[PDB]
Design a protein around this ligand. Sequence first.
Ligand SMILES: CC(C)CN(C[C@@H](O)[C@H](Cc1ccccc1)NC(=O)O[C@H]1CO[C@H]2OCC[C@H]21)S(=O)(=O)c1ccc(N)cc1
Lengths: 99, 99
Amino acid sequence: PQITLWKRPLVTIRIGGQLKEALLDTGADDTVIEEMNLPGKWKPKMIGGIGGFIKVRQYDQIIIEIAGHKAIGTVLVGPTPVNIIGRNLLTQIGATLNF
Amino acid sequence: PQITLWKRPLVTIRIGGQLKEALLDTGADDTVIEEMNLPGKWKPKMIGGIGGFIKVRQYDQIIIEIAGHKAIGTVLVGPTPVNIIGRNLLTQIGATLNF
Ligand SMILES: CC(C)CN(C[C@@H](O)[C@H](Cc1ccccc1)NC(=O)O[C@H]1CO[C@H]2OCC[C@H]21)S(=O)(=O)c1ccc(N)cc1
């Protein structure tokens, strides 16, 4: 769809079989999801945002449904304030900004 | 214009008589600009993201040009690592996310 920005662009995702709410976030390079059990191997990594750096678990090649569209790619799991869908997966679902 | 998300969606803005590069950021409620010496009244604010919070100065009714489009609204000024155009101004320039 076309999504206007008067409200937060929140969508439902399915990850590891579980439904969650997530924010479509063009300012995020990477997708970052709150702490959860996720099947797959992972690697320790760190990422930085506006307020500093956090530790995350990097899971590669994770199958995730975003607003009914399929993506398969990297999901960082850790203590983010908000579940965020970043450009690595927005590009997979063909998302663009338009004005 | 259409902006794909392979790379960071950076555009040129003009604020307080200065040109800067800024992110078109659907994940930000508010616009946050790197420290600059803006004139006028402001109110203290703290905003949080990955890593924690930063202290910013909230300026209202600030005129800003974004990729050639005029806008006027609230701009938060503080030690952000990137200039961020948030939804408060993205709506004014008619920006949508589409997939
Ligand atoms: C976490 C979001 C809910 C909110 N943020 C906007 C978000 O787009 C930031 C915007 C952003 C961009 C770069 C640096 C800091 C913040 N991106 C971000 O944290 O992305 C992280 C995940 O991918 C990585 O790529 C960029 C940093 C990492 S935020 O910058 O913290 C923020 C919070 C409140 C306001 N008013 C404005 C911005």
